[PDB]
């Protein structure tokens, strides 16, 4: 009854494979039996660990001298991979998320190739750029790439797998992309892996296009491609402290020799409260990572890269309760040897997840400097101001319409607006600002208004002629 | 007559340039603006004019510092309610209706 | 200061456990809350705040017994308006706004 | 032991400084008063679970009525004294003077009725029962003026004054304006008014201590027949009508058996945690009516000993511009623990119908009850036995308001619920049936139109009516 | 102190060295052995006695704290 009601479900994928695309046939069974070799792993499935004050170094101690001298020439040994599998329908946009207007109006993609173009065109180098796109976002990114020829950046795409949706009640498949842990199998399988080690590289730098702080940092790179004394490095993990902001995720703790990614989903009912402070785990997953290429080829030839089957449930919308088997990228520091990440200023982690983060980023809070943006002084204190824009502000095209200009912020500390609220040009939000319209009513804030520490409420309408 | 629509020079005041069109701006103010001491209190700084064509205010209204008015600006707040206009607001050819009170910190 | 955000230990008081992040979470209370007499009219039953982040109340707002406030909590009643929070209600990151009259018997 | 003998005699020397300012003749009972305080205070300094009451000590009334009626003659009434407790102003209802003088029906006042009763007795029994009122400095001169009108009437009528104690200070623990120490001050002030010795020597033996709220409290021949000529011999002494608990009167007083005899227990002397078991879970179906039958003989015996044991009821109260002030009062019923051979009898709710709010008045002046020569009783053709429940909002609280909101007190035989809130008016001949909720929001009015039949409806809105 | 009009109340908290000597209780305290005076405010509920500050007990000490967005103006100690 354990593998006996699995052998009947392996016969069902043979009823599907038969419906192949004649040519598109060798890449389908590659997936399906990677999914089967995962379904097997699905049905089966300390504490002793104390993470060391040794491995997880501070950013400040590596930033202190510091800069490489020759030549470099250390850049020609790194490949920049960015994950581009996310649709942007939570912002309310058709197709890829990296296709969303982030500033002026450089999209999410543009702001990286702009970072890279700046790099090659100031260091004589040629750092390539690899996007990992799912089956939702590959159609639509390829089209939108013709506009980067004659940009000094070599761009390559590749596809994640396409696994079947499995029923929580039925356990019978009728399509989804296996998280981002799929990187390794589909990177090796693309052919790009053997290409880059093959042209002199040895290090990958995986990040998300969501994370706008996720820049190519040198002082970290100097710690890899030509390290400080000792062997290594096979796999670095950028890691931040915890804000109240993101309470849950899981942390990097030292489990019997090597360091592990440890999830909340993984831990027994008895210790769900022990994780997340008392902050003996001031440790958080950036999802910024460097990697040894040479190492990935050795370990994905052995299949020595075992990862935890992250199980997602969901019935949405008018279907039935279904499970997706997924794996994570950090879920594999336990499988790389001598593997040790670092603590990183939040400075380097500003993911743009909702329309509220757009306002934050695309305002005079950040200065843009050829792709990369950072918190331009003067700005009194280093704290990132809180923004809670309404439900009347989610869908991007709405958000854009509500703001006839993206207003002054450099001295705001908190803003929350809800209801049909709508702004003028050259508005100034200083301090704490609360603008609330209740169901029906409307507040249009007039052009040039300077709301300093103030509570705007009631219904005020402004027409033209 | 105390806007920047006139300038003062040794006792007499006359309608300075730049006021590009000879027009005298027509200004109706509400019954809530009649007592001078009330009128002073409601305008936390006399507002910018110069480009002003028509200005008509009735109802409990308040202006903040550095309000700039230009064109025709109609502000009406019905019986009972108040309209506070935010420091720095710049109104060109608008009707304001409804009601907000802005409250501190 | 008289919330469960502090602990009374030998007269002198101190931020208690397990306030995860040792940051004093600022609050901000309406015009109708400034008078110590009206401050105890409105509460008597100082709320739960071990997991408060930001609390802001304005208007005619009164509280029940044993209210939990958790995160960002905004309570706004406009002029001519009142909001009475039910005893024991838990507010976690919520915007409460309008008109709640909780009359008795 | 050290500071307490000193902060008692600080108040001893303190109330000496008050006395010296006493009018020449107000000295007598005013010297005796603050000596009663000295007593209460010295008791205030000093300060189970064994509680659970037997099935033989609280008797169901139905058993007793089926005994039943004293045959002779009876004229067993010339052994009885009716004390009504009058102390208590009607400001809670929003009125001048004594609650005892509010218009209850037709329109007789609260007193108008209990003399109306005590009259119907004597008249149909060729006897003479005395009615004795116990009022205080608040309620006194103002009721004595109005007694003029009960002449030509067949009831001898007596008053006396409850004592009058100084409000102590919460912080200070020091006197200061004055207050009546709660109804429990009946024994000390009865004895001392002399009426107690006056009566005992006229051959009376029992007081029937009730309330002038309680329209339900009526003199009952059957409970009488059990006190004079009491079965088997015994021959007690204290008998305290008691009723069944509704959720309505949850947090009230209950008898238990503490160490031999019965005892009262108010929610106040209850250990913090055990409050949850007390009064629900029930478990204690028994609740205090405050209708008491007591032996004169025994009061005399016990007062001259200082034996009547009542717990101290401590009252914070600070109204209006005044500071925070303890006000020590005693209960009537708490006396039981000190009397002999005590027993509670369990009574129809019918006998406990106290009128404490304007909502109550509505009910009791309806077509729901019937006024039958001084006593009133709920009546057929009201077919379902229960009493209807009525909330009238803060718009109806002051008596004058209430009377002016109703052009005519409406039809209510078939009403189960009624809850009205805020600005509402009723026309003449309204008829309410079942569950009628009428609710109007801050600053709206509802005029309910004359002739209206609201049968089982929620009514919201803003509607005023107008004229010629 | 006397209130003069600008055409033609206390003396603040500063007046304490002048009215500590005023009561004379100044020469009272030093004669019994006392060497230090911990002056705080009554508003400040954090204003407790620190035995780690008494271990560094100079002629005059002022407790200080970094500026926050919260407290816009105030005194700043420079040399």
- Name the interface residues of C facing A (CB cutoff 8 Å): 18, 20-21, 28, 53-54, 56, 58, 72, 74, 76, 78, 95, 97-98
Residue D195: count other Cβ atoms within 10 Å of its Cβ: 20
> What Rg value do the Cα atoms of chain E yield, rounded?
17
Q: Is A461 left (phi over 0), alpha (psi -120 to 50) or beta?
A: beta
CATH architecture of A353-465: 3 Solenoid (2.160)
End-to-end, the C-alpha distance of chain A in Å comes to 75
d(CA A463, CA D458): 41
Q: Are D391 and C105 inside 8 Å of each other by CB?
A: yes
* Domain parsing of chain A, residue ranges: 1-352, 353-465
Indicate the pairing of strand D156-161 with strand D103-105: unpaired
- Name the interface residues of B facing A (CB cutoff 8 Å): 68, 72, 81, 83, 85-105
Q: Are A207 and A287 in contact (CB under 8 A)?
A: yes
Resolution of this entry, Å: 3.6
Question: Which residues 6+ apart lie within 8 Å of D25 measured at CB?
Answer: none
Q: Are C38 and C9 in contact (CB under 8 A)?
A: no
The set of long-range contacts for A314-317, using a CB threshold of 8 Å and a minimum separation of 24, is A315/A168
A287 - beta bridge partners? none
- Tokens representing residue E71 in the block: 């407290």
Smallest CA–CA distance from C57 into chain A, residue: A455
- Tokens representing residue B35 in the block: 């007592």
Torsion sign over Cα D169, D174, D175, D180: positive
d(CA A149, CA A117): 11
- Helix H or strand E segment including D42: helix D27-46
State CA A203 to chain mean position distance.
Answer: 19
Q: Angle at the Cα of A94 (from A92 to A100), degrees rounded to 5?
A: 75
Chain A positions in Cβ-Cβ contact with residue B90 (cut-off 8 Å): 424, 426, 446-448
Question: Which residues 6+ apart lie within 8 Å of B79 measured at CB?
Answer: B59
To the question of whether residue E43 is assigned a binding role by annotation, the answer is: yes
Q: Are A286 and A238 in contact (CB under 8 A)?
A: yes
- Annotated binding site for substrate: which residue ranges of D? 87-88, 183, 211-213, 290
CB burial of D2-41 (b: ≥16 within 10 Å; e: otherwise) equals eeeeeeeeebeeebeeeeeeeeeeeeeebeebbebbeebb
Q: Is D330 left (phi over 0), alpha (psi -120 to 50) or beta?
A: beta
Q: Are B104 and A454 inside 8 Å of each other by CB?
A: yes
Indicate the pairing of strand D165-166 with strand D178-179: antiparallel
C touches B, CB cut-off 8 Å, minimum 3 pairs: yes
Q: Angle at the Cα of D194 (from D307 to D163), degrees rounded to 5?
A: 70
Smallest CA–CA distance from A278 into chain C, residue: C20
Min Cα distance D172 → chain C (Å) is 21
Residue A315: count other Cβ atoms within 10 Å of its Cβ: 12
d(CA A212, CA A225): 24
Catalytic residue among A30, A353, A430, A454: A353
Q: Are D402 and D364 in contact (CB under 8 A)?
A: no
Q: Which fold has domain D356-468?
A: UDP N-Acetylglucosamine Acyltransferase; domain 1 (2.160.10)
d(CA D286, CA D288): 7
The DSSP symbol for A56 reads S
Q: Are A420 and A442 in contact (CB under 8 A)?
A: yes
A107 - beta bridge partners? A101
- The percent of chain D in helix, strand and coil, each rounded to the nearest 5, is 25, 25, 45
* Mutation site, E68, E69, E70, E73, interface A, largest A CB count within 10 A: E69
Please give the full DSSP string across A136-197, using - where no structure is assigned.
TTHHHHHHTTGGGTTSS--EEEEE---BPPEETTT-----B--TTTTHHHHHHHHSHHHHHH
Smallest CA–CA distance from C57 into chain B, residue: B105
Q: Which of C57, C41, C48 is nearest to C16 (CA)?
A: C48
Q: Is D152 left (phi over 0), alpha (psi -120 to 50) or beta?
A: left
Question: Which residues 6+ apart lie within 8 Å of A436 measured at CB?
Answer: A416, A417, A418, A419, A421, A443, A455, A456, A457, C74, C76, C95, C97
Question: Which residues 6+ apart lie within 8 Å of E41 measured at CB?
Answer: E47
Chain A positions in Cβ-Cβ contact with residue E73 (cut-off 8 Å): none
State CA B77 to chain mean position distance.
Answer: 14
Considering only CB atoms, E48 lies closest to which of C1, C12, C26, namely C12
What size, in residues, is chain D? 468
The DSSP symbol for D463 reads B
Q: Are A85 and A160 in contact (CB under 8 A)?
A: yes
Active site residue D356: yes
Q: Are B86 and A458 inside 8 Å of each other by CB?
A: no
Smallest CA–CA distance from D389 into chain C, residue: C105
- Residue at token pair 């029994």: D125
Q: Are A275 and A189 in contact (CB under 8 A)?
A: no
Pick the CATH number of C1-105 from 2.160.10.10, 3.30.2040.10, 3.30.230.10, 1.20.1250.20: 2.160.10.10
d(CA A102, CA A358): 7
Mapping DSSP to helix (H, G, I), strand (E, B) and coil, where does residue B96 land? strand
- Residue at token pair 């103002």: D142
- Tokens representing residue A409 in the block: 């912020």
A403 - beta bridge partners? A423
Torsion of CA C20, C23, C24, C25, to 10 degrees: -80
- Annotated binding site for Mg(2+): which residue ranges of D? 99, 213
Q: Which of D355, D219, D211 is nearest to D289 (CA)?
A: D211
Smallest CA–CA distance from C104 into chain D, residue: D393
Min Cα distance D441 → chain C (Å) is 9
CB burial of D331-357 (b: ≥16 within 10 Å; e: otherwise) equals bbbbbbbbbebbbbbbbeeebbbbbeb
Please give the full DSSP string across D123-179, using - where no structure is assigned.
HTTT---EEEEEE-TTTSHHHHGGGGGG-SSS-EEEEEE---EEPEETTT-----EE
Q: Are C47 and A307 in contact (CB under 8 A)?
A: no
- Name the interface residues of E facing A (CB cutoff 8 Å): 68-69
Give me the numbers of helices (H) and strands (E) for chain B, helices first please: 1, 8
To the question of whether residue E13 is assigned a binding role by annotation, the answer is: yes
Question: Which residues 6+ apart lie within 8 Å of A161 measured at CB?
Answer: A31, A34, A35, A177, A178, A182, A185, A186
Chain D positions in Cβ-Cβ contact with residue C101 (cut-off 8 Å): 441-442
Mapping DSSP to helix (H, G, I), strand (E, B) and coil, where does residue B89 land? coil
d(CA B87, CA D19): 68
d(CA D42, CA D53): 31
Q: Angle at the Cα of A306 (from A305 to A311), degrees rounded to 5?
A: 135
Min Cα distance C22 → chain D (Å) is 34
Distances (CA, A) of A39 to A5, A195, A281, C96, D299: 12, 31, 32, 47, 90
Smallest CA–CA distance from D442 into chain C, residue: C101
Residue D284: count other Cβ atoms within 10 Å of its Cβ: 19
Strands across the sheet with A322-326, in order?
A166-167, A322-326, A310-314
CB burial of D148-158 (b: ≥16 within 10 Å; e: otherwise) equals eebeeeebeeb
Pick the CATH number of A1-352 from 3.20.20.120, 3.90.550.10, 3.30.310.50, 3.40.640.10: 3.90.550.10
Determination technique used = X-ray
Q: Are A308 and A280 in contact (CB under 8 A)?
A: no
**φ, ψ for residue A336 (rounded to 5)?**
-95, 140
Smallest CA–CA distance from C15 into chain E, residue: E46
Q: Are B96 and A462 inside 8 Å of each other by CB?
A: yes
- Residue at token pair 């910190």: B105
Q: Are D97 and D90 in contact (CB under 8 A)?
A: yes
Q: Which of D54, D45, D348 is nearest to D173 (CA)?
A: D45
Indicate the pairing of strand D424-426 with strand D375-378: unpaired
Question: Which residues 6+ apart lie within 8 Å of A269 measured at CB?
Answer: none
To the question of whether residue A114 is assigned a binding role by annotation, the answer is: no
Considering only CB atoms, B103 lies closest to which of A443, A446, A455, namely A455
* Mutation site, C78, C81, C97, interface B, largest B CB count within 10 A: C78
What size, in residues, is chain A? 465
d(CA A215, CA A219): 12
Q: Which of A218, A155, A191, A193 is nearest to A292 (CA)?
A: A193
d(CA D246, CA D387): 12
Q: Which of D292, D275, D405, D266 is nearest to D345 (CA)?
A: D292
d(CA A161, CA A34): 9
Q: Are A383 and E69 inside 8 Å of each other by CB?
A: yes
Kindly list the partner chains of chain D, i.e. chains with 3 or more CB atom pairs below 8 Å. Answer: C
d(CA D120, CA D372): 10
Min Cα distance A363 → chain B (Å) is 19
- Tokens representing residue A342 in the block: 């670092």
- Residue at token pair 């500050």: E53
Q: Which of D216, D209, D213, D217 is nearest to D239 (CA)?
A: D209
Q: Which fold has domain D1-355?
A: Spore Coat Polysaccharide Biosynthesis Protein SpsA; Chain A (3.90.550)
Q: Are A464 and B98 inside 8 Å of each other by CB?
A: no
Min Cα distance B33 → chain A (Å) is 20
CB pairs under 8 A between A and C: 32
Residue D221: count other Cβ atoms within 10 Å of its Cβ: 16
- Annotated binding site: which residue ranges of D? 85-88, 99, 162, 182-183, 211-213, 290, 356
Chain D positions in Cβ-Cβ contact with residue C82 (cut-off 8 Å): 442
CB burial of A104-128 (b: ≥16 within 10 Å; e: otherwise) equals eebbbbbbbbbbbbbbbeeeebebb
Min Cα distance B27 → chain A (Å) is 19
d(CA A273, CA D454): 57
C2 - beta bridge partners? none
State CA A400 to chain mean position distance.
Answer: 24
- 3-class secondary structure per residue, C26-82: CEEECHHHCCHHHHHHHCCCCCECCCEEEEEEECEEECCCCCEEEEEEEEECCCCCE
Catalytic residue among D12, D317, D356, D428: D356
Chain B positions in Cβ-Cβ contact with residue A419 (cut-off 8 Å): none
Q: Are B88 and A449 inside 8 Å of each other by CB?
A: yes
Q: Is A371 left (phi over 0), alpha (psi -120 to 50) or beta?
A: left
């Amino acid at each position: 009854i354990r593998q006996e009601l699995e052998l009947s479900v392996k016969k069902e994928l043979e009823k599907i494979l038969t419906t192949a695309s004649s040519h598109e046939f060798e890449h389908t069974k590659k997936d399906l039996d990677g999914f089967r070799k995962l379904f097997h792993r699905f049905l089966q499935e300390g504490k002793i660990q104390r993470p060391p004050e040794d491995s997880i170094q501070p950013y400040e101690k590596i930033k202190a001298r510091g800069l490489p001298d020759n030549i470099s020439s250390v850049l020609n040994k790194l490949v920049v991979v960015k994950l581009n599998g996310g649709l942007g329908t939570s912002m309310g946009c058709k197709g890829p998320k990296s296709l969303i207007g982030v500033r002026n109006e450089n999209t999410f993609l543009d702001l990286t190739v702009q970072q890279i173009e700046h790099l090659n065109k100031t260091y004589n180098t040629d750092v390539p750029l690899v996007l990992m796109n799912s089956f939702n976002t590959d159609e639509d990114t390829k089209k939108i790439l013709q506009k980067y020829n004659h940009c000094r950046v070599k761009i390559y795409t590749f596809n994640q797998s396409r696994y079947p949706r499995i029923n929580k009640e039925s356990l019978l498949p009728v399509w989804y992309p296996p998280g981002h842990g799929d990187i390794y199998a589909s990177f090796y399988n693309s052919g790009l892996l053997d290409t880059f080690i093959g042209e002199g590289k040895e290090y990958i730098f995986v990040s998300n296009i969501d994370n706008l702080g996720a820049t190519v940092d040198l002082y970290i790179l100097n710690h890899l491609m030509n390290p400080p004394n000792g062997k290594r490095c096979e796999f670095v993990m950028e890691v931040t402290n915890k804000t109240r902001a993101d309470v849950k995720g899981g942390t990097l703790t030292q489990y019997e020799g090597k360091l592990r990614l440890v999830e909340i989903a993984q831990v027994p009912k008895a210790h769900v409260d022990e994780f997340k402070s008392v902050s003996k785990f001031k440790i958080f997953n950036t999802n910024n990572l460097w990697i040894s290429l040479a190492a990935v080829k050795r370990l994905q030839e052995q299949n020595a890269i075992d990862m935890e089957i992250i199980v997602n449930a969901k019935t949405l919308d008018g279907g039935l309760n279904v499970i997706q088997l997924e794996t994570a990228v950090g879920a594999a520091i336990k499988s790389f040897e001598n593997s040790l990440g670092i603590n990183v200023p939040r400075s380097r982690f500003l993911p743009v997840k909702t329309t509220s983060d757009l306002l934050l980023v695309m305002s005079n809070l950040y200065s843009l400097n050829a792709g990369s943006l950072t918190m331009s002084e003067k700005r009194e204190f280093p704290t990132v101001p809180l923004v809670k824009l309404g439900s009347s502000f989610t869908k991007v095209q709405d958000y854009l319409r509500r703001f006839e200009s993206i207003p002054d912020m450099l001295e705001l500390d908190h803003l929350t607006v809800s209801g049909d609220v709508t702004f003028g040009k050259n508005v100034s939000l200083k301090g704490t600002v609360i603008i609330i319209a209740n169901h029906g009513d409307r507040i249009d804030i007039p052009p040039g208004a300077v709301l300093e520490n103030k509570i705007v409420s009631g219904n005020l309408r402004i027409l033209d002629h």
